[PDB]
Amino acid sequence: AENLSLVVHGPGDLRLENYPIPEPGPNEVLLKMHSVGICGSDVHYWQHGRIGDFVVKKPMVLGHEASGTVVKVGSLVRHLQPGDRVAIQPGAPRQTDEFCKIGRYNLSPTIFFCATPPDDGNLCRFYKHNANFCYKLPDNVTFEEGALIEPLSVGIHACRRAGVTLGNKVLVCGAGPIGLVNLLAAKAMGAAQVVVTDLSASRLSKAKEVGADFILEISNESPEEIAKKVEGLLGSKPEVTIECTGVETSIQAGIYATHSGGTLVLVGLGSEMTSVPLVHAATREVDIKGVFRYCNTWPMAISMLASKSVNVKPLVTHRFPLEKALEAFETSKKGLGLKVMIKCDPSDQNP
């Protein structure tokens, strides 16, 4: 019974292994996997075997940005059936705790989440999942778009928490994959202009393709100088800044750059301690907000994709079959591409 699976055993130890075919409980579905995007999260576990307090204490299956086809459903599942194409939302609450009740299930301490240990991910042939967290895709939304909902959702959640809306000018720090999905989400939510900063001329070219209104190549500027160049291009201070690099200097830039009364959202992972002009922000009522994944983004993402109101397709720079997963991870690490997409279906390998 063939179920090739990509597994991290520890720092730098990545292996392709055969796994049993999972058996779906009464409210789960079994999925034949199709398209699985990888991101810095996966690469980080690969390299270091941990992300902060999340530690790989036993071999873990990677992969958490995914779509596939229902092949089997549990006795209690009614909204999905074999043949259904679905996007997988990787975080599924185990308990109806208070976070779940108030509608912030992302914060639930007992949540299951693909490829954050000890929870196995979906970079494999066959995978089972809580049925309520698999979302039927319409026929004009590709498997890859379905997989891309996950990174898009990072941007949606951050932009919601920032309060991005009609006419706002927005600064996005970083033209990596995180920055690009926040650019996409901001424009989708009505931002008039997004400026994107980055050190790389290459990444910024790609941010342009994706829809950045302005690009700004940073070199040795101070945070105040960055904020200043940003304001100069926009004609004003941006109501919202989304910081996607985790780099302290970029966080400071965001604080100086953001319009008074505005919001800076931290999406990139920084060091355990950050040094910031906390006062500068606080005295200007610039709020500083973080994000932890996302909640309630799949249906609205699917709605925007299905209506062609957002375009995530240019994000995919590489495709590899599942058998070439180790190479794909090398490609993702070298960071020349954006989204490296893994194709798990021997039957079909198109988008």
Has 269 been labeled as part of a binding site? Answer: yes
Residue 43 phi, psi (nearest 5) = -60, -35
Size of the site for its own copies (CB under 8 A): 69
198 belongs to an annotated ligand binding site: yes
Burial letters 227-254, b for 16+ CB under 10 A, else e: bebbbebbeebbbbbbbbbbbeebbbbb
Binding range to its own copies, per CB under 8 A, among 37-45, 141-149, 217-225, 267-275: 267-275
Taking the C-alpha atoms of residue 121 and residue 261, their distance in angstroms, rounded to an integer, is 40
Question: Least distance (Å) from Zn ion to the CB of residue 62?
Answer: 10
Amino acid present at 171: L
Note whether 169 and 162 are within 8 A (CB): no
Is residue 62 classed as helix, strand or coil in its secondary structure?
coil
- What is the CA angle 67-324-175, rounded to 5? 65
Cα 267-273-278 angle, rounded to 5 deg: 75
**Interface residue with Zn ion, options 8, 14, 24, 41 (CB under 5 A):** 41
Binding partner of residue 39 among Zn ion, its own copies, none, CB cut-off 5 to 8 Å per kind: Zn ion
Is 15 annotated to bind ligand?
no
Answer yes or no whether residue 201 interacts with its own copies by CB under 8 A: no
Of 49, 48, 46, nearest to 16 (Cα)? 46
Region near its own copies per CB under 8 A, out of 41-49, 63-71, 286-294, 316-324: 286-294
181 binds its own copies (CB under 8 A): no
Which residues does a gap of C–N over 2.5 Å follow in the chain?
none
Contact between 315 and Zn ion by CB under 5 A: the answer reads no
Q: How many CA atoms lie within 13 A of 8 on its CB side?
A: 29
Which residues are bridge partners to 195 per DSSP? Answer: 171, 214
Residues 89, 297: Cα–Cα separation, whole Å: 9
Check residue 327 for interaction with its own copies (CB under 8 A). no
Beta carbon of residue 134, minimum distance to its own copies (angstroms, whole number): 12
- Binding of its own copies by 215 (CB under 8 A): no
Stretch of residues binding its own copies (CB under 8 A), selected from 31-39, 58-66, 199-207, 303-311? 303-311
The interface region with its own copies, picked from 56-64, 113-121, 263-271, 321-329 by CB under 8 A, is 263-271
Using the rule CB under 8 A, give the single segment among 64-72, 120-128, 261-269, 328-336 that binds its own copies: 261-269
How many C-alpha atoms does 221 have within 13 Å on its Cβ side?
Answer: 19
Position 39 contacts Zn ion (CB under 5 A) = yes
**100: partner contacted, choices Zn ion, its own copies, none (Cβ within 5-8 A by kind):** its own copies
Q: Is 300 in the site for its own copies (CB under 8 A)?
A: yes
Site membership for Zn ion, residue 267 (CB under 5 A): no
Size of the site for Zn ion (CB under 5 A): 3
- Angle of helix 325-334 versus helix 40-48 axis, rounded to 10: 100
15-74 residues near its own copies, rule: CB under 8 A:
52
Of its own copies, Zn ion, none, which one does residue 237 interact with (CB within 5 to 8 Å by kind)?
none
CA 69 to chain centre: 21
**Among residues 148, 150, 155, 154, which one has the least CA distance to residue 185?**
155
Residues flagged as binding site? 39, 45, 64-65, 150, 178, 198, 203, 267-269, 291-294
Which residues form the interface with Zn ion (CB under 5 A)?
A: 39, 41, 65
Which residues form the interface with its own copies (CB under 8 A)?
A: 52, 93, 95-107, 132, 156, 160-161, 165-169, 185, 188-190, 192-193, 213, 251, 260-261, 266, 269-292, 295-296, 299-301, 303-304, 306-307, 309
